[PDB]
Chain length 239, copies 4
């Protein structure tokens, strides 16, 4: 019948555009009280409570948590989705290129969870989901630093899963393959084709498809015994 | 809102008791036209179309397919769930102990899919799910033969996934941890405790919990881009 | 300095040609007393003790064990390498095509280990290695049955590893990518190229390269704490 | 006969004590010209060329590279082994606790490879190995940050493997289980026992055992086709 997500308060980092917006949108049409953090809050999602925050700044995220708790109530769900790339071959990557992705994609994830966690423990309820990636698990050329971080979140989620279990709090990861967002839609046609040919399903995925995987893991009904897991959504691109 | 499973015809092997019954029951309350095969069809599930069949016999399964197609219509979903154990330490296992699990758990799975596959290809639609196991992925003492087969189904599903993609047909696997069925509820209390202590979640899983994972993979709406994947439901017992 | 393999008795199934011959050859030049079983024993390896045996027949393998124990002494190492293919798309595969690969590749592996295991336990020493495959882990089109079995051996080895640990007996698996044997050297040039382009290393592997991985796992010196592991040799084809 | 490591120049980060010292020691007795970087260089390894350097400082590592190249010649091998812990439960971990492990264990690894990589590419030869961990792959309680980084190095190595293949340069990872170093030998007896009971092999591993796995991956002879792989050395603790 129903996923136990009605009136549940959920925070999505990076939820203004792209995959994050898609997660926000779907959770809304499941009856959740969704909030999102980002650098801009346009959206155009009206009913969503956008909060300008920066995952690399812990004060910024703790403030957003306070604002969200105050307006919507105690938080059940967190989707750590905000991430960036600084793509280049290993010897062309500067310390700045490492500092940037490590801050948003690794540190920023923990800073996105840290302001909601103690409360989740008190309420003995909560579902945490980090995003990504096929590059994190398989590896990717030019993404030696992106990959380190997307493989890093999987390790963070597995340990967090083992810590949170005594409170009935779950942590999992979704590892998307190549997904049609505005970013990947601007990549050269000849590169899109080379990649699409690697995918047995013969297409990139859609954002609403990642949203569904996140929803499944957030549902206290559909995945109550799922924790520490990586859910691959890649059309058999990586198996 | 809804998983695209209303009026969808789904076959569950081993669906009279245990986990299979739970999968049957939940698919029913999602509006699916569910059928099951087994050695007995009591159930007591009335509205479910029980067909006496044997996964080790291909004539038996092709007959059941014919009966099911005829009564309910063209098949969308298949859950290859029927499996057995012949547990013993490696040197105490007889050829009969190998023949038995290999037939039901490996061969029987392919024989459960073979009578529905050509039609799924014609209709360019279908979602296949094999079950198990934590023992298949981690290994288990006394289950050297059970494990070979539950690891074998994962390989079967990954290859089938890659073959079926050109028809929009998906294949995945669910790998349950230790689940409270009537079989595991009769295992010695001191062994149940030794195992339960290994599980961060501090309990065995429930059958309706495996049912939900199977439903997620069958949904053409919730997992349209999920294929070739293993979904672990183990409470972080194996991560 | 040296791998503790001098004067060690090692049995290699399928060791007359191909990868098996390569494993036999290298173990010999490490000072091991190597024997092999196969359907033919030409070899042309002279110093190797070829025994005509069939992995699908347990009497046949137990006889070979007796012969080998008698001529060379108590067995330390076993390489379960004999395997076959019956390649076809899932709906074109006959029960005979399933029975064949399941017997040689799954059952035949256990039947290759069963006649040496009780003695290894007595001597509290031994290293077991099964072969394969990239198809077992990734999946492969047209190899839905080969893959089920090569994924099956990994599960068998992980469980056997957990059982054999109390005797200091180790079990592991080597998962080769595409390897230049006489079989793969007869595959069409256009298919060889399509595959070779998938491999970052830009070549198929060589048999002496699989031999080295097997040697590493057999060495009681180099891998004394390695058990339950899969060693991939694929040139980053599957990561 | 021999691993192609005689007269090969190899750098080991964190090689003064513990596992690093063990790797240094074994490579030496394989005829390699080994150097190590660390915060102290006592050792007491005399013949090893200790260089005081800090993996978190890129100038410091590029200087060490220059010194090592100048004294020993062009570098073939790099073992990124230096790592630290700041163990605590997720909500007790400060930004400083994240910054520390992320710098040494993730960033520090890339900074250990960056000064040798361009030359390896020129010479079309090289083998890179990062360390760890069982916590990186499985997850561990109290190590939510250590784990993120040890899972991160695996992703870094897989991407680096795919980039370096066009130059015949290999990258792999060794994932040790619990190893008897001076650090783990000071952990409480009751915790050592709780952990040792989880290990089928019934003991922690030894440093010379990790050294052997690193040697295998560095050998241009024994692992010429091994790249992008994780080699687990855990006594079946994690399978």
């Amino acid at each position: 019948l129903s996923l136990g997500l009605e009136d549940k308060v959920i925070v999505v980092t990076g939820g203004n555009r792209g995959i994050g917006a898609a997660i926000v949108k779907l959770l809304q049409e499941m009856g959740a009280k969704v909030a999102f953090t980002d650098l801009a809050t346009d959206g155009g999602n009206t009913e969503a409570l956008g909060v300008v925050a920066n995952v690399t700044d812990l004060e910024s995220m703790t403030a957003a948590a306070a604002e969200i708790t105050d307006k919507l109530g105690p938080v059940y769900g967190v989707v750590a989705n905000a991430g960036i790339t600084k793509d280049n071959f290993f010897p062309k990557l500067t310390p700045a290129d490492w500092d940037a992705v490590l801050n948003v994609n690794l540190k920023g994830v923990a800073y996105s969870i840290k302001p909601f966690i103690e409360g989740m423990y008190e309420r003995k309820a909560g579902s945490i989901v980090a995003i990504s990636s096929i590059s994190g698990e398989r590896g990717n050329v030019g993404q030696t630093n992106y990959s380190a971080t997307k493989a890093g979140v999987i390790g963070m989620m597995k340990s967090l899963a083992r810590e949170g279990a005594r409170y009935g709090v779950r942590a999992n990861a979704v590892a998307p393959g190549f997904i049609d967002t505005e970013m990947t839609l601007a990549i050269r046609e000849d590169i899109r084709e080379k990649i699409t040919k690697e995918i047995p399903f013969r297409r990139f995925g859609k954002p609403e498809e990642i949203a569904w995987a996140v929803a499944f893991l957030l549902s206290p009904v559909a995945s109550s015994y799922v924790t520490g897991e990586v859910l691959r959504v890649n059309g058999a691109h990586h198996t």
